Design a protein around this motif. Structure first.
Motif, PDB file in Angstrom:
ATOM      1  N   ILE A 142      40.815  24.973  11.418  1.00 28.25           N
ATOM      2  CA  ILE A 142      39.585  24.334  11.841  1.00 28.25           C
ATOM      3  C   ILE A 142      38.587  25.453  12.065  1.00 28.25           C
ATOM      4  O   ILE A 142      38.785  26.299  12.936  1.00 28.25           O
ATOM      5  N   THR A 143      37.526  25.499  11.275  1.00 29.19           N
ATOM      6  CA  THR A 143      36.483  26.466  11.560  1.00 29.19           C
ATOM      7  C   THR A 143      35.686  26.009  12.769  1.00 29.19           C
ATOM      8  O   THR A 143      35.688  24.827  13.129  1.00 29.19           O
ATOM      9  N   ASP A 144      34.996  26.953  13.400  1.00 35.49           N
ATOM     10  CA  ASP A 144      34.201  26.639  14.578  1.00 35.49           C
ATOM     11  C   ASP A 144      33.046  25.703  14.274  1.00 35.49           C
ATOM     12  O   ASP A 144      32.614  24.975  15.163  1.00 35.49           O
ATOM     13  N   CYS A 145      32.587  25.650  13.031  1.00 37.68           N
ATOM     14  CA  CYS A 145      31.541  24.714  12.663  1.00 37.68           C
ATOM     15  C   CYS A 145      32.087  23.307  12.463  1.00 37.68           C
ATOM     16  O   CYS A 145      31.409  22.332  12.791  1.00 37.68           O
ATOM     17  N   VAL A 146      33.311  23.173  11.955  1.00 37.43           N
ATOM     18  CA  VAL A 146      33.954  21.863  11.895  1.00 37.43           C
ATOM     19  C   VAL A 146      34.233  21.357  13.303  1.00 37.43           C
ATOM     20  O   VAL A 146      34.028  20.177  13.613  1.00 37.43           O
ATOM     21  N   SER A 148      36.964  31.728  13.012  1.00 39.83           N
ATOM     22  CA  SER A 148      35.769  32.037  13.786  1.00 39.83           C
ATOM     23  C   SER A 148      34.637  32.320  12.812  1.00 39.83           C
ATOM     24  O   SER A 148      34.491  33.444  12.334  1.00 39.83           O
ATOM     25  N   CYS A 149      33.838  31.304  12.524  1.00 42.85           N
ATOM     26  CA  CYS A 149      32.710  31.479  11.635  1.00 42.85           C
ATOM     27  C   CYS A 149      31.579  32.194  12.356  1.00 42.85           C
ATOM     28  O   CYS A 149      31.356  32.000  13.552  1.00 42.85           O
ATOM     29  N   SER A 150      30.868  33.040  11.617  1.00 47.11           N
ATOM     30  CA  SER A 150      29.825  33.898  12.171  1.00 47.11           C
ATOM     31  C   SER A 150      28.534  33.631  11.416  1.00 47.11           C
ATOM     32  O   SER A 150      28.163  34.374  10.510  1.00 47.11           O
ATOM     33  N   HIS A 151      27.833  32.585  11.825  1.00 46.37           N
ATOM     34  CA  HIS A 151      26.543  32.239  11.258  1.00 46.37           C
ATOM     35  C   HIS A 151      25.829  31.360  12.264  1.00 46.37           C
ATOM     36  O   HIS A 151      26.409  30.927  13.259  1.00 46.37           O
ATOM     37  N   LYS A 152      24.562  31.106  12.003  1.00 46.73           N
ATOM     38  CA  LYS A 152      23.818  30.168  12.814  1.00 46.73           C
ATOM     39  C   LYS A 152      23.969  28.776  12.226  1.00 46.73           C
ATOM     40  O   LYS A 152      24.217  28.612  11.031  1.00 46.73           O
ATOM     41  N   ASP A 208      28.487  24.121   4.021  1.00 42.69           N
ATOM     42  CA  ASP A 208      28.059  25.457   3.637  1.00 42.69           C
ATOM     43  C   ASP A 208      29.082  26.503   4.032  1.00 42.69           C
ATOM     44  O   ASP A 208      29.384  27.401   3.240  1.00 42.69           O
ATOM     45  N   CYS A 209      29.630  26.402   5.247  1.00 43.22           N
ATOM     46  CA  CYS A 209      30.584  27.415   5.693  1.00 43.22           C
ATOM     47  C   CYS A 209      31.875  27.371   4.890  1.00 43.22           C
ATOM     48  O   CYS A 209      32.393  28.420   4.494  1.00 43.22           O
ATOM     49  N   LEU A 210      32.377  26.168   4.599  1.00 38.23           N
ATOM     50  CA  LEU A 210      33.610  26.026   3.833  1.00 38.23           C
ATOM     51  C   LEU A 210      33.429  26.486   2.400  1.00 38.23           C
ATOM     52  O   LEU A 210      34.289  27.192   1.865  1.00 38.23           O
TER      53      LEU A 210
END
Ligand SMILES: [Zn+2]
Lengths: 102, 454, 121, 126, 171, 134, 74
Positions: free
Chosen positions: D35-39, D66-70, D76-78
């Motif tokens: 699970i990414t932090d954005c999910v 641990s995704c590193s973006h705003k 987009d992150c996946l």
RNA sequence: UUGCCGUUGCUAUGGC
């Protein structure tokens, strides 16, 4: 050069007989060559060449070995008595044909 | 506890399989097969013979007449002997010579009779693996074997041939090649009181022959390294050992089946077993065998183990860890090349690179209570096996044999309660397969005979 | 720390010597010190075995510097005689090398021995 | 190792499939779900109707990146972290994300279909 | 055997291309057969993982499965865990066949030379000449793959082309 | 009532409970060797068949023992061969991979129900289980 | 006097296109479409060929100072 | 008592 191995030799006095299993070994030969095998069997045992007999030959895959069933008699006359007629037709002297009708 | 549950469920399983001592206890099929057993013939070859010569502590040990007859042949390799039911012996060397001896003059050193020396003249004119039917050895004869009846000696080596020589003249009667490129023979053993030879060839193969018929019986496969040693008794069983696969197999040769026996000593559990209160370790390569009787045998390893094995246990019954000592460590004037003794001592790492002598010869007298071990510790060892057949123990040493012992076997004399034997041991200054052996410490190429008594 | 430092104990030594024997049968072993340094500077080598008891020791200590340069595992077996006997030749060897091959039938065994001697090293 | 997103979790709970056991009997292999932090941010932003889905994503068997973006745009992150590396299975049920992932090559795609998970661009499933 | 689910996707086509080219296979049926029975194997090992520790089924069928997988040779001796049966895959199974093994042992120069050696009977494991290429040699028959002694690449009498050329050059 | 001679209850069954996982564990923890063949001798039709399974080589050993024991070749009896040889070789090439049969892992049959969990020594008393331990 | 039949009446391969010798064997076709595939793979990627063969001669094909073939993150 | 060579014994050893 063929090679011979007898195993599990028992004696049947009721049938006046000595029986065993025959591991026949022919590296780079075709197969058992049954008349030559009866010669080799009749000289490794005592003489009685028309009283030694083999019937059950199975060669394993790739050749070399074959297991047969060897039975050797004393007294060629009682061997002729006790052996069956088809094996006597195959090897020895008997020949009686069946009447071909119907 | 999972292994406890495995043992428990296996016990319940076997109890359930039994489910699916009285005054009457007779079973019909067993007694019928016993009637056939009473009917059959040939209670001759297939004796499951146990140990019937219990004489280990009986005979003398410490005052043997030891004659080390040195011979002029570089690196003698094998020894074959003979007794009828005059005695001849045979040696063979890396100088491509077979030599016949008389040995029956028991109180003195053996007597040379006849040479038979192959050489560069016997290289075949083909380099083709099935026209290898020359009449002599052109490379490295490794093993001799005398017939149990004494008509022939049969020898072979790294020229992948079996040359069978007559006894009375040392003449090559017949040549049988092993028909492939790596087919070097490494050990030969006749089954006792017979004409059947068992050769162990480096193709992971075991060839069998009938010598008086000049025929090959059966090729049997199944080791995983080169079959470094072979052993047989009067039964049609055989026992071979391949070198680095650390297993010894025994072969029902008519059935062409085997029983394997692996090693399995680990310095972790062994040093823990000592840690409950020590320079001993794992195993390199099982090297030599001799079948003591038709239920037991003994194996000589590469880390100096001698092990005793039964026919009914995969893991060995008894071990003996160091059987000839640990080798002298390399000197400080031959390890490092520094100037000071402190750094040249630091280049020994303490005890970490002391390697044991490896037993390169082992001979069990057939069905007896005593076997002989030999390596380049200079002293043969004599061990007797205890009468309950679960251990052996060092009786004494035979310290007149300086060199590697490439072969041990004994020669009998005397009757059922008073006996004397001469232990022949081929002594070289080089192992019987490759060189590998430094620190030749006063060795000579000879025949160490000992005369043991009582 | 001795000069011949990353020595193997007895179990690792026999694992090493068994895979050395199998690579020698499969023509994947280059045996001897200057053949080992030849295959090391050529880059076809997966790990080098030096024996820690030959009569000098710097005679093969030249090789750890080469292995360090090219990031190749190196391990010290405590018997040159057993190493030559495993190599399958009739003499003691002091160094041997397992050459790289991908049509090799013992690649899993070589990789397992590489992992063991690299966690040692 | 399989990257999950929010509609895959919602369809898992709607079809009553366990995450790690559904993954294991889909692929017949041992799976590590991520699970990414954005999910996770998207599941938390879904509100208090989706409490069951959020505290089933809170599972110690489901590891988490641990995704590193705003921003919290999980698609987009996946897509970025899968086309960077190609060592990921993407478990998703968005039609747009399914089309993006099956247009970039070498990326297997898992999806809730029927009563178990299905996998498409993984060529060794049996 | 049985066909896969989506048999025509491009990953599957490039997969079968790499497998058949790297192992010298004749068609898709080799991959599909060995993958079908591998699917049965690790579909069973999945259930052996979904049951718990100290289950009788798990203990006995698990050590039975990993020991006969080690003896087939697809699993090494040290990984005696049951998740490596799940990590197992199809080329670990068809690296064990005799064509692959003849080429890796170096009796042949390629997998196609290995296939024609096997089908022309120059290769015998142990005692018997094996003559089909997809044989799945075991960990004990791994080291007795050698040239048959009935064959000119062993030590036997040379074949008809060599002996006819020798006779015509003797004429 | 009265007794009636039942060969089905004094006949050696030993096969309702013979499970290959238990038998494999017993062969592992047996501490006596196993009579394996010289390695090429047990493959069958130059590799056109399998190697042969352990049950197949046990059955082959039994047939050759009976064969030599009363001097008779077995035959090509049509109904039994069209059942057993063809169905046996087709499940052999289905489930026997490299001399090892993996058919059991694809088969529902409870281990502990029939072959474990003893029925006679069920120990349905606290006192009987206490005496069975001690 | 025996008017034997011939090959076109015997095998009856009426009016076929010209076909491929590599298609006459299913194994050789996949041998030669895998050789084609792994020759195309040298075009798309850069394939590890096995390291430095002899002396390092040079790049043998050119060095581009403007192209950077590296994957940027996000 | 051997391929040489040394002590040799009037038989045992030790250097290649
Ligand atoms: Zn993110």
């Amino acid at each position: 050069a063929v090679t011979i191995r007898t195993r599990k030799v028992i004696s049947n006095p009721l049938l006046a007989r000595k029986q065993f299993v025959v591991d026949v070994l022919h590296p780079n030969r075709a197969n058992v060559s049954k008349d030559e095998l009866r010669e080799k069997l009749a000289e490794v045992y005592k003489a009685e060449k028309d009283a030694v007999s083999v019937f059950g030959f199975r060669t394993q895959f790739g050749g070399g070995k074959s297991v047969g069933f060897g039975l050797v008699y004393n007294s060629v006359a009682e061997a002729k008595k006790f052996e069956p007629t088809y094996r006597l037709v195959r090897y020895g002297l008997a020949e009686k044909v069946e009447k071909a009708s119907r | 506890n999972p292994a406890d549950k495995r043992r428990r469920l296996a016990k319940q399983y076997l109890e359930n399989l039994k489910s699916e001592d009285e005054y009457n206890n007779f079973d019909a099929g067993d007694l019928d097969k016993d009637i056939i057993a009473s009917r059959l013939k040939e209670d001759v070859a297939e004796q499951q013979g146990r140990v019937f010569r219990y004489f280990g502590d009986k005979l003398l040990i410490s005052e043997a007449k030891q004659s080390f007859t040195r011979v002029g042949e570089n690196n003698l390799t094998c020894i074959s002997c003979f007794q009828p039911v005059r005695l001849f012996a045979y040696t063979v060397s890396k100088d491509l010579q077979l030599t016949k001896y008389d040995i029956t003059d028991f109180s003195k050193r053996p007597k040379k009779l006849k040479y038979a020396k192959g050489g560069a003249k016997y290289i075949p004119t083909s380099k083709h693996e099935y026209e290898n039917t020359t009449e002599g050895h052109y490379d490295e004869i490794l093993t001799v074997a005398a017939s149990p009846d004494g008509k022939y000696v049969v020898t072979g080596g790294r020229d992948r041939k079996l040359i069978v020589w007559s006894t009375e003249s040392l003449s090559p009667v017949k040549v049988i090649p092993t028909k492939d490129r790596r087919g070097e023979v490494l050990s030969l053993a006749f089954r006792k009181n017979s004409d059947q030879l068992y050769a162990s060839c480096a193709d992971f193969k075991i060839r069998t022959y009938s010598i008086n018929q000049f025929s090959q019986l059966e090729i049997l496969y199944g080791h995983h390294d080169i079959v470094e040693d072979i052993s047989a008794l009067a039964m049609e069983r055989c026992v071979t050992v391949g070198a680095r696969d650390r297993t010894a197999m025994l072969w029902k040769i008519p059935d062409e089946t085997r029983l394997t026996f692996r090693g399995g000593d680990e310095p972790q559990k062994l040093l823990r077993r000592w840690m409950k209160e020590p320079l001993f370790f794992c195993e390199g390569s099982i090297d030599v065998v001799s079948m003591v009787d038709d239920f037991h045998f003994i194996t000589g390893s590469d880390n100096g183990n001698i092990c005793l094995w039964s026919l009914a246990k995969k893991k060995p019954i008894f071990t003996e860890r160091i059987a000839h000592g640990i080798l002298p460590e390399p000197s400080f004037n031959d390890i490092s090349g520094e100037t000071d003794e402190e750094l040249r001592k630091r280049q020994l790492q303490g005890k970490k690179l002391l390697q044991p002598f490896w037993i390169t010869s082992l001979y069990a007298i057939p069905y007896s209570n005593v076997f002989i071990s030999g390596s380049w510790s200079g002293s043969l060892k004599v061990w007797k096996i205890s009468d309950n057949l679960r251990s052996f123990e060092l009786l004494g040493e035979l310290s007149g044999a300086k060199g590697v012992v490439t072969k041990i076997q004994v020669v009998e004399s005397g009757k059922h309660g008073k006996e004397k034997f001469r232990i022949l041991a081929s002594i070289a200054k080089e192992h019987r397969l490759g060189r590998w052996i430094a620190n030749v410490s006063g060795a000579r190429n000879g025949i160490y005979s000992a005369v043991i008594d009582q | 720390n001795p000069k011949a430092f990353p020595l193997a104990d007895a179990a690792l030594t026999q694992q090493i010597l068994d895979v050395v024997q199998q690579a020698a049968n499969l023509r994947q072993l280059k045996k001897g010190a200057n053949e080992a340094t030849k295959t090391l500077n050529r880059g076809i080598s997966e790990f080098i075995i030096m024996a820690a008891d030959c009569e000098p020791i710097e005679i093969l200590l030249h090789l750890p510097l080469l292995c360090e340069d090219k990031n190749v595992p190196y391990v010290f077996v405590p018997s040159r005689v057993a190493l030559g006997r495993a190599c399958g030749v009739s003499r003691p060897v002091i160094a041997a090398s397992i050459t790289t091959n991908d049509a090799s039938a013992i690649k899993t065994q070589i990789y397992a021995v590489k992992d063991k001697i690299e966690t040692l090293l | 190792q399989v990257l999950i997103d929010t509609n895959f979790i919602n369809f898992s709970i709607q079809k009553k499939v366990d995450i790690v056991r559904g993954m294991m009997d889909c692929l017949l292999a041992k799976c590590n779900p991520l699970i990414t932090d954005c999910v996770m941010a998207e599941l938390e932003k879904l509100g208090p109707k989706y409490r069951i889905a959020l505290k089933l994503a809170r599972d110690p068997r489901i590891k988490r990146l641990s995704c590193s973006h705003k921003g919290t745009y999980a698609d987009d992150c996946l897509v970025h972290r899968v086309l960077q590396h190609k060592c990921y299975i993407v478990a998703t049920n968005d039609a747009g994300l399914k089309q993006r992932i099956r247009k970039i090559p070498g990326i297997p795609l898992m999806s809730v279909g029927g009563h178990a998970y299905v996998i498409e661009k993984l060529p060794d499933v049996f | 055997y049985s066909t896969p689910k989506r048999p025509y996707e491009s990953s599957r086509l490039d997969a079968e291309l790499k497998l058949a080219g790297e192992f010298g296979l004749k068609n898709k049926k080799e991959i599909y057969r060995i993958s079908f029975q591998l699917s049965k194997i690790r579909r069973a090992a999945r259930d052996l993982l979904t049951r718990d520790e100290k289950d009788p089924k798990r203990l006995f069928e698990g050590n039975a499965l990993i020991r006969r997988l080690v003896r087939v040779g697809v699993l090494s001796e040290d990984k005696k865990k049951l998740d490596y049966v799940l990590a197992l895959k199809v080329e670990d199974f068809l690296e064990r066949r005799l064509q692959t093994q003849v080429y890796k042992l170096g009796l042949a120069k390629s997998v196609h030379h290995a296939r024609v050696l096997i089908t022309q009977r120059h290769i015998a494991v142990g005692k018997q000449i094996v003559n089909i290429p997809s044989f799945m040699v075991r960990l004990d028959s791994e080291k007795h793959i050698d040239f048959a002694p009935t064959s000119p690449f062993g030590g036997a009498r040379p074949g008809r082309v060599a002996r006819r050329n020798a006779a015509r050059k003797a004429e | 009532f009265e007794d009636r001679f039942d060969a089905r209850e004094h006949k050696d069954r030993s096969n309702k409970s013979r499970m290959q996982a238990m038998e494999e564990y017993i062969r592992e923890s047996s501490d006596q060797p196993d009579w394996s063949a010289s390695i090429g001798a047990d493959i069958v039709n130059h590799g056109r068949g399998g190697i042969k399974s352990l049950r197949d080589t046990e059955k082959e050993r039994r047939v050759t023992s009976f064969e030599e024991d009363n001097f008779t070749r077995l035959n090509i009896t049509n109904k039994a061969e069209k059942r057993k040889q063809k169905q046996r070789e087709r499940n052999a090439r289905m489930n026997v991979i490299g001399g090892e049969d993996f058919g059991i892992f694809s088969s529902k049959r409870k281990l502990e129900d029939s072959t474990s969990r003893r029925g006679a020594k069920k120990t349905r008393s606290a006192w009987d289980r206490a005496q069975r331990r001690l | 006097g025996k008017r034997a039949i011939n090959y076109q009446i015997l095998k009856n391969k009426g009016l076929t296109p010209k076909r491929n010798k590599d298609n006459r064997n299913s194994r050789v076709k996949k041998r030669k479409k895998y050789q084609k595939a792994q020759k195309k793979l040298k075009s798309v990627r850069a394939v590890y060929s096995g390291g430095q063969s002899g002396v390092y001669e040079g790049e043998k094909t050119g060095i581009k100072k403007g192209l950077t073939r590296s994957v940027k993150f996000k």
